[model samples]
Target chain A: KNVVIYADGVYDMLHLGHMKQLEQAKKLFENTTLIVGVTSDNETKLFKGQVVQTLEERTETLKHIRWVDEIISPCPWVVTPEFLEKYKIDYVAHDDDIYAWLKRAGKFKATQRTEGVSTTDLIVRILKNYED
Target chain B: KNVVIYADGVYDMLHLGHMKQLEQAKKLFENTTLIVGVTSDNETKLFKGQVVQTLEERTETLKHIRWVDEIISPCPWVVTPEFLEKYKIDYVAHDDDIYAWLKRAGKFKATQRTEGVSTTDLIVRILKNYED
Candidate 1:
């Protein structure tokens, strides 16, 4: 059976950590179809602070990674069973335990967090060293 | 004159460290054009050991990055004056001091190494945990 893995994130300033996480999702099954759900700018600004790139730019950025087969532009902040059913996603992958709801529904696939890399860390570094 | 920055690497796995380096390169000047030179498979094997992705895949991957404006696929392993002149590159950017030759020639811009994230680390992690 074909497996479809879904991962969602702000994906701002697209970096290696994001790629690593997606790579892990792709590895979960043979001939896996990896789909990325990019968060909307409104949701990102509300929860994750100001993003360096816009939703359009972030979506374009995610489209470039070789591992990613499909993308959901302006994805919902929360993944609901309806969302999963709509997309026909077999599993949702993330490094954090915030998806306890998905876990309970038997639709979550946990991936290890890539150490030492995060959008927050990159933003902090940029602010500290590059901000004029 | 518009500053054109050049960065070269195998870019096998395409990770955060690579993005950080390119981000640093873009920050060096206003309206900068960041060009990446992806090494050929033969050259990569000779110098950087076996690569995870093909040259075409690597080039496509780099093209998707928002910071990268251009790419030289199957680029020469050794950067030469002719190569730079051909591309009209003003400066070569790298995180390491291996480009002493370019530095002497006044065409090198040193960017700080991003701590922690690297292709080696990713490969090791994949081998240790994901490999069957």
Candidate 2:
């Protein structure tokens, strides 16, 4: 039986930092099946402040990653036990911690973030590149 | 004996694309030793038009990568047979293909870049983020 791991994120603009998180999740344990669930456009926009890329485009980046086994679009922001049971998701992978239920359920597997890179940092770098 | 691979680049911001090249080089063969050489600030500035990060900071990014075994700062833009011989570098890893001597000496190992992410792309994404 394979260990099913769930990694959900907004993944706007789909940069290197996001890729490292997936790489960590994919190799978090032996024989793990990594399923990346990208939040929907509406959900992403609410939390991420702005949605730079569409859902399909964002998920396309995940397709190239060697570690990711499957991708679920429009994953609910709040993953319930029912969701875990339905998908057989054994663990949730994230850096900031999804919180409350997942950790209590022993389903939270923390993925270390790649330092110095983030959507916000990338945005700032871009903005700073052209001050005029 | 282990295979020695050399992956060199400007690594201006040390994005995902650079990391992938190292990963590919590290796993290209069994018992591979990946040596990452980051070009100097002066050399980088001349070619890249502007050096965003200094050589030390640029090389520091390579320090965290699990694949990289050694770091060489102020790496020459043109790698010679003497350079490869001195370091015992069996292969040269790059995207556009570092030409002439390396290829003739059968040391050029091409690394496929992580598509869609580049220093230029990152800059543009940042610029587009705030056009107003």
Candidate 3:
């Protein structure tokens, strides 16, 4: 069986940190089939109060990413139950909440990758540095 | 004179955590002109090697934000002494490198704000929690 892997995010700005996660994730499995479950700009808005880009922009960005084999624009509800099982995804790559939720629900089947320096951290650092 | 303050980023996959940063940053002074300096997918890649969204996607998302008065796509070479002088930019807000550089050059005046709970830390937390 192919080692189908999955990850999800808005991936709005698409930073190098994200690339590191994808590169490392692909290496974890041999027959890695990457499925990116992207949240639409609307969905991302619900999570992050600020909206800086549109859904099409987010989708277009994901389409060109090297690690992504497929893209799914998931509504808030579909992300959990349907999307995860539909792809026969062996693992789910996500931040803390997703990881815990998957494990608590006994849905986590395989490992995931996380980056060392995150876009958010870099942003904050930039903000604070000049505040002085 | 109206103070035009600005900041920008992909701001993809918004989170409540981001809200706190905006709220705190906004309260700094009266008549704060918030200008977000958003990097397009292409520009973001030049700074950090990654592309999660398209240029249109990044811009569209930023258009709707409350804190931003105007959205500008900053080029790699735009952050220079000439640009600073041309803008009559009473002061420039930025991170350590920009801040130190500006201070040493006597280019900055006034104040700015920085954010807490960066996306990187949030992402790292999510990744490490599962690995343990």
Candidate 4:
């Protein structure tokens, strides 16, 4: 049976940090299928305050990356056992404390989030350099 | 006026090699507008066989890369003076001899193509490990 890994995030403003996380997840297993779950626009806006890209745009963006084998658009903000079972997902990979619930439930696989660059950082740079 | 740089390619698999090229193009000038042009599906198929992603998919993929500011989908197979003029393109950035015609027209800027990884190399790996 093939091993399937699931990684979920907002993935706004797609940057090198996001790429590093996906790369680390892919490295964990050979011939592994990496399915990325993009959180819904409504959920992101509620907490993240005005996402740069919409759900459809984010989905289209992630679909093209080399590390991404498949994409689940409008994925649930929080993963559940039912979601894992339905998708045949073996592990939900992430690096943030946001997945503590999943960790306590024994479904989370911790991967290192790349330091320095992030979606938020990129947004700040764009704002700071708006006049350029 | 912003310095607008143009890079054209098949960008089929969206690998690190392509990413490197785009990154290099972006480094050419401050606040540079890096516009990537993806060749038409028919053109790619005639020379490269069935592409891994459709023209629409390829366009979406390139659009999300941090270095890419814009994407011209179904771009002409060969760059022309008229094409450059219409888009206000300052230079055509590429590392391949395929852009010799553009170079002769004094519009090509040579950038180093990242070695070792390529779309063909990735395809070979996928085929070799197809059973895995």
Candidate 5:
């Protein structure tokens, strides 16, 4: 069905897992508009460890992914239906269960996360190999 | 002269200005061994701009540039003569007047910085154009 879809992440040092998740974001429905929201630098730093890529870089990186129809950046940590209305989002796609109300309201769609490789995982890999 | 030359910086988001500086590094002398030292993430955060790319990413970017002969990562902020001895750097190149001891000891060579573009300028450009 024709509808708008939004998926969001810190997208720090983007990996194949992020691609797969975005794959689901577009694959789950037909006639969809996939909007990727990149978390803000300050927000992500507060939420997690040091982000390797700035929010602007992260947003620019997502622009090249074919699955993405639009990119909204510097997104806040929390989500609500009001947010959905503000962005005119019809469905929210992600692997996390944090969008509780959206889930209960049938506006949330969950995609399975790619295991093992992640932002922190890659950071550790870089750090561990730094001595090499 | 078949002497070794070293240029060091954060090289955060490699740009044309950086390319030009490297050009001079190679062009300044005959049979030059241009060694680029990229500062560490930890050290960069001390006085460096919020880096747009990781140490690995920044280091990787140099390998593609034809002018670069070798790249060393995670360099210390304070460069010592011992480092010059260990690396056999006959000349250290930069635009700053701050390498007082290096110039006095005949290990320092200066290149005029590229006009207009700089790391800070690029950062501002990215931030200003983020509206697009």
Candidate 6:
């Protein structure tokens, strides 16, 4: 029996756009426990540049989501090879290289969900006013 | 023209628990431009230790909020005294000693609202299995 784990950016800005991806992923493994991985502050800054809220705020926000079982911090990117082997994560879900790395190492499987509007694009919309 | 800007943490976790404080502060000044100053990650970590989300995540989360107009970065704590003088901020609102310092400096008005459940306590409750 494999304990299925799911990880992603899972930012505080999760919207209906994200639901499409998350739901599909959840249905993949019926009996596996779901562990959602969120990118850490450093990682978010390094990768996504900026996030609207803090790590604690994002963590608490995700706590209320029914789809997520366990919330892991600082993202799986920071997890050492030792941690990965010890946890035995069955799968990792992402739309980026992070997931690819995990898959290549044979440490965990990868699921690439559909991509959609991101937090950055949303911010750009909010900051600017257009005729369209 | 008095530009009264009021800002808050405005985390993605904003709920009724935070509404009361926000409403009261907004109502305090009529015709005053309210700018909600959300604490930066550095400041949040310096004071509150761990936060629930990241700065960009928090900023985008708050952008959707109708109460706020302009979103500032880093936070006032990191702002230099010269920058403070340049902004000519009419008031700064908070329930901490930082507010006291600003008040003593005679830079801006200060208001303190009732304290309530914080993100930290909420996380603890959700994480630990409690009978109560």
Q: Score the docking of each candidate (DockQ).
A: 0.07, 0.10, 0.02, 0.04, 0.03, 0.02
TM-score per candidate? 0.51, 0.63, 0.41, 0.49, 0.46, 0.42
lDDT, candidate 1, B14-80, per-residue tens: 6566766778897798778988889899887786686556687577657656588888887788888
Name the fnat for model 3: 0.00
Q: Would you list the C-alpha lDDT of every candidate in the order shown?
A: 0.77, 0.76, 0.55, 0.76, 0.75, 0.56
Candidate 3 residue-wise lDDT, B1-132, digit = tens: 566443445554443333334433444457766555556666566766664545654554444333445656653324666765555444454433445676786644433333533444445554664695
**What are the per-residue Cα lDDT tens digits for candidate 2 across A1-132?**
679999998876654577678788988888899998889988777766776567876776566565679999878888888989999889988886447678887889888877775545655665787898
Candidate with top TM-score is: 2
Using alpha carbons, what is the TM-score of model 6? 0.42
lDDT of 4 by residue, A36-78 (tens): 9999888998976656556875676575566788899988988
Prediction 3 global C-alpha lDDT: 0.55
Tell me the docking grade of candidate 5.
incorrect
Residue A27's lDDT within candidate 6 is 60
Runs of candidate 1 exceeding 4 Å displacement: A1-132, B119-132
Worst 10 residues of 5 chain A by lDDT: A117-126
Q: Which whole-number lDDT from 0 to 100 does residue A122 have in model 3?
A: 52
lDDT score, candidate 3, position A98: 41
Please write out the lDDT profile of model 2 over residues B56-115, one tens digit for every residue. 766755665657789888788888888888998899887764386667877777778777
Please, what are the lDDT tens digits per residue for candidate 5 over residues B55-120?
A: 886786565554778888877777898999899889988877469999899888887776654444
| Model 6 error, position B131 (Å) | 48
Ten contiguous residues minimizing lDDT sum, candidate 6 chain A: A114-123
lDDT of 3 by residue, A5-95 (tens): 6776666655555655666565666777877776766656776654444566556555544566777776342456566676676777654
Question: For every candidate, what is the interface RMSD in angstroms?
Answer: 11.4, 6.2, 12.0, 15.0, 10.6, 11.8
Deviating ranges (above 4 Å) for candidate 3: A75-78, A97-101, A104-132, B1-132
Task: By DockQ, rank the candidates, best first.
Answer: 2, 1, 4, 5, 3, 6
lDDT of 5 by residue, A1-132 (tens): 588998888987655567668878888886898888888888888887666567766675565454778888877678877788998889989886466778788998889887854544543454564576
